[PDB]
Amino acid sequence: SDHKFLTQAVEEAYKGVDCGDGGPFGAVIVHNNEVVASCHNMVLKYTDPTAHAEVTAIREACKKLNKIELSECEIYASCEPCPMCFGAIHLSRLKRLVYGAKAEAAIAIGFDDFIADALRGTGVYQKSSLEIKKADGNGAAIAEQVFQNTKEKFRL
Amino acid sequence: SDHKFLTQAVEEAYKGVDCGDGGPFGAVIVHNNEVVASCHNMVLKYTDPTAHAEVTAIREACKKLNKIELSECEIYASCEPCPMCFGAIHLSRLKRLVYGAKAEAAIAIGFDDFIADALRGTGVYQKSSLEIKKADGNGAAIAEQVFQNTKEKFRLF
Ligand SMILES: Nc1nc2c(ncn2[C@@H]2O[C@H](CO)[C@@H](O)[C@H]2O)c(=O)[nH]1
Ligand SMILES: [Zn+2]
Ligand SMILES: [Zn+2]
C-alpha cells in the first residue's frame, strides 16, 4: 500500500524527467486509498522555481477537493522534501508523509545541498507534528536508484 | 529605496485583506529600483495554501522575466517569511530579502508559530547565503501595525 503509492511517485519522477517538465521528482497525494493528485516536478514546464513535485501535488489536491487543508490526506514523495516543500506540507495540514530516498541521493548527482531542518528534527524555531515515514526495503532501493539512472540517461 | 518598496508590500497586505484574497501579507520583487512583481496572500482566492505573498511574487516575477532564477532581483516582505517562503526565496536565488515585521507580530494575532531557522541564523541543514535586512524605525512600525489594524477583518488560515 505504502509501496504502491511510493512506486507511483517514482514512476511520476521518471515520467517528468523524460518529458522535460522538470527534475526527477514525483509526489502523490492520497485520501483514504483514493489518489487525489499524481504529479511531478514542473519547474521547467511552468517556468516556476516553486513548482516542485510536492508543491504541484498540493496545489492540485487543494483545487480538486475545494479546501486549503489536506488533513485527511497523505503525501508520498519519491525524494525527501526540501525546506520549501516541507513548509508547504506543514501549511497544507497533510497528516502523513512517506518519502522514499534520502536527500543525499539527489545531492550525489549535483543537486542543491538543501535539506529541511524540520524534517530531520534539527531546528531551534521550526518543529514538526507531522507523521514522517522514511521508506525502507524494496521501495527505498527503487526510489534511491532514480538519481543514478537519470544521471546515466543524460551522461552523453 | 528600501522604505518605498517595504511600504508597497504593506499596502499589498492591506489590499489583499480588504478584497478577501487572503491574509495580511504582501511581497514586492524589484530589479534595480524597478518593480517586477507586487503581490499579496492569495490562499483564499486560489484555494492554494502555498500561495503566500512571497511565493506568489516569485511565480509572477519569474513569469515576467521568463526564467526560474532572480539572482539580480531583491524581495521586500511585509512580514518575516515562513519556512516555505524562505525556501522558495532560496530556490529563486533572490540576492536580498528586506522584511518588515518579525513573525511574532503575525503569531500574536492568531497565525501559527512557524519560523524559518535559516533566516534567523539557527539552521543546521538549510544555510542561507542571501543578504537579509530586518526593517527598523518607521518601516518596522508600519509592518507591525498591519496586524493590529487588520485584527479580525479576514478569514484565518
Ligand atoms: N511571511 C508570511 N507568513 C504567512 C503568510 N500567510 C500566512 N502566514 C503565517 O504567518 C505566520 C508567520 O510567518 C506563520 O504562521 C505563517 O503560516 C504569508 O503570506 N507570508
Ligand atoms: Zn521541494
Ligand atoms: Zn510564507
Author numbering:
A (entry chain D): 29 to 184
B (entry chain A): 29 to 185
What does the paper say about this structure?
In plants, guanosine deaminase (GSDA) catalyzes the deamination of guanosine for nitrogen recycling and re-utilization. The other involves the hydrolysis of Gua to guanine (G), followed by its deamination to xanthine under the action of guanine deaminase (GDA). Both deaminases are zinc-dependent enzymes, which rely on a catalytic water molecule to attack the amino group-connecting C2 atom to proceed with the catalysis. The zinc ions are tightly bound to the active site, coordinated by the completely conserved residues His80, Cys113, Cys110, and the key water molecule. AtGSDA catalysis needs two key sub-processes: the activation of water and re-capping of the active site, which proceed via the two critical residues Glu82 and Tyr185, respectively.
Furthermore, the Y185F-Gua structure indicated that only one Gua molecule was bound in a substrate-bound conformation but the ligand could be clearly distinguished from the non-reactive state, judged from the rotation angle of the purine ring. It should be noted that these cocrystal structures showed averaged results of multiple deamination reactions, as either the substrate or product could be present in individual enzyme molecules. Accordingly, the C-termini of the enzyme adopted the mixed “in/out” conformations with the last residue Phe185 in the “out” conformer missing. Lastly, the “out” conformer was also observed in the cocrystal structure of the partially active mutant Y185F, and there was only one ligand in the dimeric enzyme. Y185F had difficulties in binding to the substrate, as shown by other single mutants (Y185E/K, etc.) or truncated forms of the enzyme, while retaining the correct fold (as suggested by TSA). The Y185F conformations were reminiscent of the apo-enzyme, where it had one disordered C-terminus in one monomer while that of the other formed loops and pointed out. We found that while WT and Y185F/E showed similar binding affinities toward the ligands, the Y185K and E82Q mutants showed differentially reduced affinities.
